[PDB]
Amino acid sequence: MTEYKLVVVGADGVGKSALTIQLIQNHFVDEYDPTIEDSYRKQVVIDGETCLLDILDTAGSAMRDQYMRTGEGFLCVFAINNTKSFEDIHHYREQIKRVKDSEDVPMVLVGNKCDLPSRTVDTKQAQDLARSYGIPFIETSAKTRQGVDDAFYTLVREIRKHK
Ligand SMILES: Nc1nc2c(ncn2[C@@H]2O[C@H](COP(=O)(O)OP(=O)(O)CP(=O)(O)O)[C@@H](O)[C@H]2O)c(=O)[nH]1
Ligand SMILES: CN(C)Cc1[nH]c2ccccc2c1[C@H]1NC(=O)c2ccc(O)cc21
Ligand SMILES: [Mg+2]
């Protein structure tokens, strides 16, 4: 079966771990336990194809160069109530594009914490940025699990399209 190496990137606190844990364990992590590095495996069925997801959950370096080279697809995560994390997105995309020496790298823009009321990043703002990059935009909530499977499965489909 096909294996997909996915990397979850973004500013410290956007919900990279909570999104990953919701995907893998169907569990919401309320606590804020900072990540050094953690990878997870999950067998899933996407478009009738049973495949293996190998997901790397990163810290919000030679180690960074290595996983960006290895990573087939990237979830660029920001929190919808955090303008600073949205402003950070281009820095992550720039690092990945530089390491992979490609303007065509499978990526998905993820607007997390969509369950929270005081939103500072509009859907239009996020959609316009994702459109300028030629990538999908998915609104997610690691709290309710809204859009979690969508973000990861969409990334897998972007990888399938690329190859
Ligand atoms: N309400 C709400 N809270 C969230 C959501 N996602 C994450 N959180 C909360 O934000 C905090 C940080 O989440 P975490 O997943 O640890 O973020 P992170 O980006 O991995 C932090 P680091 O970069 O240090 O590894 C946690 O308290 C978590 O419960 C969400 O979608 N909605
Ligand atoms: C192979 N799996 C058991 C673990 C795993 N899953 C991934 C998903 C996306 C990208 C990389 C990886 C890796 C590792 N492969 C590396 O090159 C690397 C560098 C730094 C790390 O912290 C981890 C890895
Ligand atoms: Mg984390």
Numbering used by the authors: 1 to 60, 65 to 167
List sentences quoted exactly from the publication behind this structure.
The 3 human RAS genes, KRAS, NRAS, and HRAS, encode 4 different RAS proteins (KRAS-4A, KRAS-4B, NRAS, and HRAS) which belong to the protein family of small GTPases that function as binary molecular switches involved in cell signaling. In the “off” state, RAS proteins are bound to the nucleotide guanosine diphosphate (GDP), while in the “on” state they are bound to the nucleotide guanosine triphosphate (GTP). The γ-phosphate of GTP holds 2 regions, switch I and switch II, in a compact conformation that allows interaction with downstream effectors, such as CRAF, PI3Kα, and RALGDS, as well as with the allosteric site of SOS1 and SOS2. Oncogenic mutations in RAS impair GTP hydrolysis, leading to stabilization of the activated GTP-RAS form and enhanced RAS signaling.
Based on the X-ray structure of 15 bound to GCP-KRAS, we chose to introduce a phenolic oxygen as a H-bond donor at the 5 position of the isoindolinone to interact with E37. The 5-hydroxy-isoindolinone 18 was 6-fold more potent than the nonphenolic matched molecular pair 17, with an isothermal titration calorimetry (ITC) KD of 20 µM. X-ray crystallography confirmed the desired phenolic H bond to E37 at a distance of 2.7 Å and, all 3 previously discovered polar interactions to D54 and T74 were maintained. Given the improved potency of 18 and the high conservation of the SI/II-pocket across RAS isoforms, selectivity was evaluated using ITC, and 18 was found to bind with similar affinity to both the GCP and GDP forms of KRAS, HRAS, and NRAS, including both mutant and wild-type KRAS. Compound 18 also showed biochemical inhibition of GTP-KRAS with SOS1 (EC50 = 33 µM) using a time-resolved fluorescence energy transfer assay. A dose-dependent decrease in phospho-ERK levels was observed 2 h after treatment of NCI-H358 cells with 18, leading to almost complete inhibition at 50 µM. Guided by the X-ray structures of cocomplexes, we were able to optimize binding, as evidenced by the discovery of the isoindolinone 18, which bound to GCP-KRASG12D at 20 µM by ITC and also displayed inhibition of the key PPI with KRAS in a similar range.
